[PDB]
Amino acid sequence: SGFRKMAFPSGKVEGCMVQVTCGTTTLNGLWLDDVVYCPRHVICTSEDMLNPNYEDLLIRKSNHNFLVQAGNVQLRVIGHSMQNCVLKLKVDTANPKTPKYKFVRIQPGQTFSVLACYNGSPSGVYQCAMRPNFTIKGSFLNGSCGSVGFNIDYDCVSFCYMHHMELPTGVHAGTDLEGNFYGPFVDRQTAQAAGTDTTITVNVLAWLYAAVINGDRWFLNRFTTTLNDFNLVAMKYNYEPLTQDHVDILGPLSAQTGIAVLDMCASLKELLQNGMNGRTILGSALLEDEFTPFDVVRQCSGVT
Numbered sequence: 001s002g003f004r005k006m007a008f009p010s011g012k013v014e015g016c017m018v019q020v021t022c023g024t025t026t027l028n029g030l031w032l033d034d035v036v037y038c039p040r041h042v043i044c045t046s047e048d049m050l051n052p053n054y055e056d057l058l059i060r061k062s063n064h065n066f067l068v069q070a071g072n073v074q075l076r077v078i079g080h081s082m083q084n085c086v087l088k089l090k091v092d093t094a095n096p097k098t099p100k101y102k103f104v105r106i107q108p109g110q111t112f113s114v115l116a117c118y119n120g121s122p123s124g125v126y127q128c129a130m131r132p133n134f135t136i137k138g139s140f141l142n143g144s145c146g147s148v149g150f151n152i153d154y155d156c157v158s159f160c161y162m163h164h165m166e167l168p169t170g171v172h173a174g175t176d177l178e179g180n181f182y183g184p185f186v187d188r189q190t191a192q193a194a195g196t197d198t199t200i201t202v203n204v205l206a207w208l209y210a211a212v213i214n215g216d217r218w219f220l221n222r223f224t225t226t227l228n229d230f231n232l233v234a235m236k237y238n239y240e241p242l243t244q245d246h247v248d249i250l251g252p253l254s255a256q257t258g259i260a261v262l263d264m265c266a267s268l269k270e271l272l273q274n275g276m277n278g279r280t281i282l283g284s285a286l287l288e289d290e291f292t293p294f295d296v297v298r299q300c301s302g303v304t
């Protein structure tokens with residue numbers, strides 16, 4: 001029993017981290033096969049960040065300007081290309097630690113593990129959700145650029161995020177591994193703000209099911225509700241609309257506990273309208289929305 005925010009084991013991604021240097025800028029790269037992926041603002045200096053034309057800046061860059069370092073050992077760059085907001089540096093050695101992998105673009109509400117890195121070396125690992133406003137509530141300093149977000153399916157690492165930047169509210173923005181930003185953000189030092197940070201309703205419900213599984217069920221009331229009637233209440237508290245797809249995805253948890261999704265919705269409804277009254281659910285004084293239904297199942301059934 002017990003329920004914790006849990007990252008995937010990071011060993012397979014640690015073997016892919018390298019340091020990339022160009023000019024005075026040092027940041028992290030991801031080395032998979034004979035390619036290093038990193039954020040394109042490696043090309044920029046402190047002057048350039050206001051309004052850089054990345055294509056023009058790239059004209060002045062040769063292969064030998066890019067120093068790539070795995071541990072103490074240097075990798076020879078034999079080619080470079082810009083793909084959207086990432087740079088692909090072709091090197092002459094394939095990574096011997098390349099795990100089984102693919103690049104996925106995740107959906108909002110889905111979660112992943114972040115291996116926060118500085119100078120190509122790991123600082124630590126934590127779990128994040130892609131917020132509905134396409135930001136993440138991370139922990140990143142200067143130098144963290146190129147740190148990656150991933151999930152693991154048995155042996156296959158799915159890379160979903162590369163870190164690029166921090167927004168005014170202390171939240172973070174980045175790209176998929178094809179260099180496309182999540183959200184409307186650009187890799188430019190200009191006025192940018194996150195939209196309204198809404199709660200991932202289906203995840204809250206998943207977490208309530210986790211609470212019940214762990215014996216922490218004081219919040220279960222005697223009411224039920226309808227999907228439309230719950231959704232009216234959701235809208236008021238900036239909760240995302242609950243759909244029938246979300247109901248179906250909660251089915252495994254509903255079946256294990258014997259509590260229908262709409263019964264749980266009615267208990268959530270009461271927590272929204274009355275608050276928690278100083279009480280906790282799984283050691284938390286607020287409602288947690290960064291556990292997917294799949295996250296809950298995995299932790300409660302001991303998937304490896």
Ligand SMILES: *C(=N)[C@H](C[C@@H]1CCNC1=O)NC(=O)[C@@H]1[C@@H]2[C@H](CN1C(=O)[C@@H](NC(=O)C(F)(F)Cl)C(C)(C)C)[C@@H]1C=C[C@H]2C1
Nearest residue numbers: 041140141142143144145164165166167187188189190192
């Ligand atoms: C990468 N090393 C670094 C990570 C940042 C630094 C502090 N916390 C982080 O996560 N990235 C940057 O410095 C990027 C960089 C610059 C400016 N920038 C920012 O994150 C800046 N933010 C913004 O401009 C904003 F999000 F739009 Cl408000 C700032 C935090 C330094 C003010 C250009 C924009 C993105 C890349 C190029």
